[PDB]
Design an enzyme around this catalytic site. Structure first.
Site, PDB file in Angstrom:
ATOM      1  N   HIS A 190       3.960   1.940  11.314  1.00  0.00           N
ATOM      2  CA  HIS A 190       2.992   2.102  10.259  1.00  0.00           C
ATOM      3  C   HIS A 190       3.163   3.468   9.614  1.00  0.00           C
ATOM      4  O   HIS A 190       3.053   4.518  10.250  1.00  0.00           O
ATOM      5  CB  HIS A 190       1.551   1.921  10.741  1.00  0.00           C
ATOM      6  CG  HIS A 190       0.622   1.524   9.636  1.00  0.00           C
ATOM      7  ND1 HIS A 190       0.198   2.382   8.644  1.00  0.00           N
ATOM      8  CD2 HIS A 190       0.098   0.316   9.325  1.00  0.00           C
ATOM      9  CE1 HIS A 190      -0.562   1.706   7.792  1.00  0.00           C
ATOM     10  NE2 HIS A 190      -0.637   0.448   8.176  1.00  0.00           N
ATOM     11  N   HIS A 236      10.355  -6.862  19.505  1.00  0.00           N
ATOM     12  CA  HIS A 236       9.208  -7.757  19.362  1.00  0.00           C
ATOM     13  C   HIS A 236       7.887  -7.030  19.432  1.00  0.00           C
ATOM     14  O   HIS A 236       7.629  -6.260  20.359  1.00  0.00           O
ATOM     15  CB  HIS A 236       9.192  -8.808  20.464  1.00  0.00           C
ATOM     16  CG  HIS A 236      10.386  -9.706  20.469  1.00  0.00           C
ATOM     17  ND1 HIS A 236      10.617 -10.648  19.491  1.00  0.00           N
ATOM     18  CD2 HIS A 236      11.417  -9.808  21.344  1.00  0.00           C
ATOM     19  CE1 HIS A 236      11.742 -11.296  19.786  1.00  0.00           C
ATOM     20  NE2 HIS A 236      12.255 -10.800  20.897  1.00  0.00           N
ATOM     21  N   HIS A 286       4.003  -1.657   7.904  1.00  0.00           N
ATOM     22  CA  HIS A 286       3.048  -1.465   6.815  1.00  0.00           C
ATOM     23  C   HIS A 286       2.906   0.041   6.594  1.00  0.00           C
ATOM     24  O   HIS A 286       3.467   0.807   7.359  1.00  0.00           O
ATOM     25  CB  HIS A 286       1.706  -2.127   7.156  1.00  0.00           C
ATOM     26  CG  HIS A 286       0.862  -2.385   5.956  1.00  0.00           C
ATOM     27  ND1 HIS A 286      -0.454  -1.996   5.852  1.00  0.00           N
ATOM     28  CD2 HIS A 286       1.187  -2.987   4.791  1.00  0.00           C
ATOM     29  CE1 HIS A 286      -0.903  -2.360   4.660  1.00  0.00           C
ATOM     30  NE2 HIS A 286       0.069  -2.977   4.008  1.00  0.00           N
ATOM     31  N   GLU A 293       0.878  -1.160   0.000  1.00  0.00           N
ATOM     32  CA  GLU A 293       0.000   0.000   0.000  1.00  0.00           C
ATOM     33  C   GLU A 293       0.915   1.209   0.000  1.00  0.00           C
ATOM     34  O   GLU A 293       1.364   1.625  -1.062  1.00  0.00           O
ATOM     35  CB  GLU A 293      -0.953  -0.059   1.176  1.00  0.00           C
ATOM     36  CG  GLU A 293      -1.979  -1.147   1.002  1.00  0.00           C
ATOM     37  CD  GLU A 293      -2.915  -1.240   2.163  1.00  0.00           C
ATOM     38  OE1 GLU A 293      -3.031  -0.260   2.942  1.00  0.00           O
ATOM     39  OE2 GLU A 293      -3.500  -2.321   2.335  1.00  0.00           O
TER      40      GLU A 293
END
Ligand SMILES: [Cl-]
Ligand SMILES: [Cl-]
Ligand SMILES: [Cl-]
Ligand SMILES: [Cl-]
Ligand SMILES: [Mg+2]
Ligand SMILES: [Zn+2]
Ligand SMILES: [Zn+2]
Ligand SMILES: [Zn+2]
Lengths: 166, 166, 166
Positions: free
Chosen positions: C91, C86, C59, C40
């Site tokens: 984003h 972790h 992302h 995206e």
């Protein structure tokens, strides 16, 4: 286990771990890196145009159900036009109504979230019913009905934010 | 790396990423979507009847160990009858005693959690020792021993809740 | 989609879901159980010696970019010598400067984190710019610039902690 019912226009990435009686409606988009397993609580429903993003887990308790819009019992019911965003945990028994936004790393467990709610990031919703059209600010830990009953209404800016993410 | 020691009656889903010297006892249930890697900190122990749920990561620091019930050093020791629930992060050095419930999206890192604790959802436990039989409410961020020393005892309702989840 | 550009000395585990225009520099270490998808928002940059740990998702939104150190637009820019530990969620749009530590289960979304910050565990950083060299204590939910402007400077003990984890 029963097999998933996957609508012809739904997209389920091959890296999604999808198992059991999961009823997936039109134009659903299920990302890689998702787990949607009706191996304990069952069945699940995912309504039309709903997006399940990478990192999400959807699971359910063997015992405990919600009533879906069809009157049937579900472990997890997620309505139409819902965004279940990265790292969210939706754990049955759970109902999420049409048009909800569930923001990053947020959990809904043993709860009902009414249509049109905007739930922001790093939120816990457990053991409550949130009426339709409420906003939950980031970081809130909602574990009592008294807290749920204090939540503000979604304002235009909240809808705009959710729209900008989705 | 050494190989895992998997008891004959343990269940390890093929989608679990299990690597290294991980010593898994009787009737353990390890779900898909789990990562249990003794590639840095090592060894790990997972006691009998313990359940590791989908979304969990268990890892350890190269340096830093706890003493297991056998007197040996471990990066991560998880006792018998423990529930490590969805999205929990257990990061060595870490000891979790028998019968603990570690609720959804909770972290234990550089810490000891005594037997019979009930740790709820979205909790951080780091750099502390929690004595046996304590309850940690959802959302708490426990990073100092002073906080750990204030925790309430598990009450019957907390055990009942944990039982209803597991 | 474009293909990743993976430096000859970078390590990308075969279980990492790496897709799209992700530009990975020297000596990067990407663990199993990671998702790094420029499908995206695109492109992404991961600078030299940076470690992306198991459970991380990276992302980006289709719309919204940051300026990288090369003057180009990126959905996600992660600098050199960064630890993305972790369960972190990075984003896009997002910039994380050189030498940052992003602790367990922390999120950076629509934000810039200056070089040399130490972000601890269970933190949300959204919609803000954090100047270089700031410390963010565990559990903080930073959603406004006013909060970001109150953050303390990294002290030697914070660097030592981060060093002990990494
Ligand atoms: Cl996604
Ligand atoms: Cl998480
Ligand atoms: Cl599970
Ligand atoms: Cl790792
Ligand atoms: Mg995962
Ligand atoms: Zn479950
Ligand atoms: Zn680790
Ligand atoms: Zn995304």
């Amino acid at each position: 286990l029963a097999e998933p019912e996957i609508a012809p226009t739904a997209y389920v990435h091959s890296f999604s771990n999808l198992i059991g009686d999961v009823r997936i409606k039109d134009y659903v988009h299920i990302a890689p890196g998702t787990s949607i397993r009706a191996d304990e609580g069952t069945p699940f429903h995912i309504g039309s145009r709903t997006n399940i993003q990478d990192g999400v887990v959807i699971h359910g308790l063997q015992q405990g159900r919600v009533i879906g819009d069809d009157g049937q019992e579900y472990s997890v019911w997620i309505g139409d036009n819902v965004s279940i965003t990265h790292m969210a945990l939706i754990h049955g028994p759970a109902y999420i109504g049409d048009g909800c936004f569930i923001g990053f790393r947020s959990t809904v467990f043993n709860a009902r979230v009414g249509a049109g709610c905007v739930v922001m990031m790093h939120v816990l919703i457990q053991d409550v019913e949130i009426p339709p059209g409420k906003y939950v600010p980031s970081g809130m830990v909602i574990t009592t009905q008294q807290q749920a009953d204090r939540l503000p209404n979604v304002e235009e800016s909240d809808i705009h934010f959710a729209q900008h993410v989705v």
